[PDB]
Every structure is written in structure tokens, then in C-alpha cells.
Amino acid sequence: DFMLTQPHSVSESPGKTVTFSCTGSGGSIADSFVQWYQQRPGSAPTTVIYDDNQRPSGVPDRFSGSIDDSANSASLTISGLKTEDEADYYCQSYNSNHHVVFGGGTKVTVL
Template sequence: NFVLTQPSSVSGSSGQKVTISCTRSSGDIGDDSVHWYQQRPGSAPTTVIYRDDERPSGVPDRFSGSIDSSSNSASLTISGLQSEDEADNYCLSYDSSDSHTVLQTMGK
């Protein structure tokens, strides 16, 4: 198993670009996809980046994700910073070799 470590906080001024890092403790960062979630105060988390660098429909292109194998870390970059970007941002990954269960539901 591995641990993902993020800085406790990052800050920037309006219009600036900020980058949030997510460092993997063991194994290669590229072995398993990294996903990023943003949670604004009083709201449920939403996906802003999935599979390292993919952006869901509706997420502005100010948000981008990347992987850096040299530092064994992933990054979320937000450019053109806006006041609405103030939020908690979480990285998530999991070991694809771990046991897991797929639940399927059958429609009528």
C-alpha cells in the first residue's frame, strides 16, 4: 500500500496560477490513475480531474492535471485563479492490484 501526501494549504492571488502537488510514498505514480476532487464550503465534492489529466464535461480548462515521474507526484494546476476556487482539493488513487468488487445493478 502507499500514501498520498499533499501540502496542507496553498495560496494565490486573483488571476495567478497555483499548483497543488500529490506525492506517492511508494511505487510509481504512473502505475495507478490519480483523480482530483474539489469540495467548496457547504457543498459535496466534485471531480475536477480524473485519470491523471482528463477533465470532466463542465469543468473549466483553467483546471489541468499532470504526472511527474521524477518526483513521483501528481499535480493539479488552476490558472486564472478566481475567488470561487477557494476550496478543499483532494487527490485520490488506489492500487489496481488490490482486491475489489464490482457491483452491477440490472434494470427492469
């Protein structure tokens, strides 16, 4: 089965940069678009990146998505970290049957 492997925590001080990845297992990351969601406790996820690297309207440009074909991975980078960025982030894509697959999630802690 196609799975997405994600580390579960990163932490930095305000103003710094964090990045974390989502690695494909059982399939190629490049075959399907990768999305990233931010999620706050008890609330629905909101899109921060769709279609590998696109930001919806209103998402600050300090959020950026990338794909590393050689590593079979997708990454989310948050520059100029803000206190309000402390939340959980999930990558998401699709398997060969067009069904949804989620990464395990990363908690960004702002110090």
C-alpha cells in the first residue's frame, strides 16, 4: 500500500525556519499531488499547500512546499516562524486507486 512517512515534531524560536518532510513508501511521491494542512486542536484542517507547492489565498508566503524526486519526498518549510504557527501539520496525497493517504503529522512547537 502507498503510505506517507512524516516525522512527528520540530521546534524553533520565533523568526527561525523549520522544515519537515513526507516520504513516499510503496509508491512514487511524484505520481500524485501533495497537499499540506494546518490543524488546531478540535478544529477542521485548513489547507496551507495544495498541488505540491501552491498557496491558497490568505496563506502567508512564509509557508512553502517542495518535492524532492530523488528522495521520494515532499517538504513543508515555514520561514520566519510565528507564535501562531504552533499547530499540527499533515501531508496528504493519493494512492493508485485515487484514495486519500495522510502522513502521520508533525507538531510545530514555537519556543
